[PDB]
């Protein structure tokens, strides 16, 4: 039900813990602060719409960069906290916290820029991007600024060292307690790998088994992007493994890019396992069991990110993949609750 689903989604942002997690993510929050500041020349003395303003922090960054008027639109009850944060910082004459969905807000003017932090796990979980695109079409002046301006999706095959340790735990029990439990390994593999949920977990370079590849890109100014979201975002990929390891599946992550403005140097916010950890971690797609691979084993496939039929805000990923000389396989995943 939409009244329930959307209402409950916005109510999840009315609690402190999610905002604590987002604002405690210094990689994310500083990237926005600096990406906004990089665009001082387009923002100073100009007007901004903040889509999904939360506690108001990004709208405040825009005012500190010199924006004349910021419309901070927030559909959850957290807008009331944003109103107090804005006043606490001496900004209520310029930054206007507006309750409700951006889809129905009525601003007194089109704006020079939109800022929004709309990205969920696996980039598109929560399905907020459509709201930003709706706001761009309705409210952004021609040639106006979008912050960030684009997103890119990346994949790499992985050998998850933590998963390997959890599966190997059962073969270690005998040395610790004198009871052989090595026969539990197949059961543990079915439980931890055989399900069909997208798993949000932090990896490192030690887990990455081949050079990461971009498999899709989302340029927010593009008119056709809304319908691509409905049909599925993604693409084919092909890589060659660095070395021998048990292949456990794939990690999907994203980056977003802020235009460089006067500096002519764009700022990239990345969620790669090769870069500092963020609250988004990575989105892990486990195969049903490990598959041994070696140096120069080719792995290919196709990944599609779709809204789930049951809940339009729940990310589904359809994976098709081929490891080496093995048969083509498929697996259909949905975001873990």
């Amino acid at each position: 039900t939409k009244s329930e689903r959307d209402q409950l989604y916005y109510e999840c942002y009315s609690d402190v813990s999610v905002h604590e997690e987002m604002i405690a993510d210094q990689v994310r929050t500083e990237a926005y602060r600096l990406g906004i500041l990089k665009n001082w020349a387009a923002l100073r003395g100009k007007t901004v719409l903040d889509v999904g303003a939360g506690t108001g922090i990004l709208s405040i960054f825009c005012a500190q960069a010199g924006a004349r008027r910021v419309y901070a639109v927030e559909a959850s009850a957290i807008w009331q906290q944003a109103r107090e944060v804005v006043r606490l910082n001496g900004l209520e004459d310029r930054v206007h916290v507006l309750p409700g969905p951006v889809e129905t807000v009525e601003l007194p003017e089109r704006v020079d820029a939109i800022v929004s932090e709309w990205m969920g796990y696996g980039l598109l979980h929560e399905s907020m991007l459509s709201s930003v695109l709706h706001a761009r079409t309705k409210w952004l002046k021609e040639g106006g600024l979008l912050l960030p301006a684009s997103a890119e999706l990346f994949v790499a095959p992985i050998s998850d060292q933590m998963l390997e340790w959890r599966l190997g735990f059962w073969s270690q029990v005998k040395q610790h307690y004198g009871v052989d439990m090595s026969c539990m390994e197949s059961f543990a593999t079915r439980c931890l790998m055989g399900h069909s949920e997208i798993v949000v977990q932090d990896l490192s370079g030690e887990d990455v088994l081949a050079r990461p590849q971009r498999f899709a890109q989302l340029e927010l100014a593009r008119a056709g992007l809304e319908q691509e979201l409905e049909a599925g975002v993604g693409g084919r990929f092909r890589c060659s493994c660095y070395g021998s390891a048990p292949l456990h599946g794939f990690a999907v992550w994203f980056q977003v890019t802020f235009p460089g403005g006067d500096s002519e140097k764009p700022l990239v916010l990345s969620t790669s396992p090769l870069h500092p950890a963020t609250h988004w971690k990575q989105a892990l797609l486990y195969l049903n069991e490990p598959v041994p691979v070696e140096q120069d084993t080719d792995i290919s496939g196709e990944i599609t990110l779709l809204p789930s039929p049951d809940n339009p805000r729940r990310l589904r990923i359809l994976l098709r993949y081929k490891v080496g000389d093995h048969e083509e396989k498929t697996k259909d995943f949905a975001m873990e609750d």
Partner: peptide, 6 residues
């Protein structure tokens, strides 16, 4: 852990 789980 719980962003957008609503």
């Amino acid at each position: 852990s719980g962003x957008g789980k609503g």
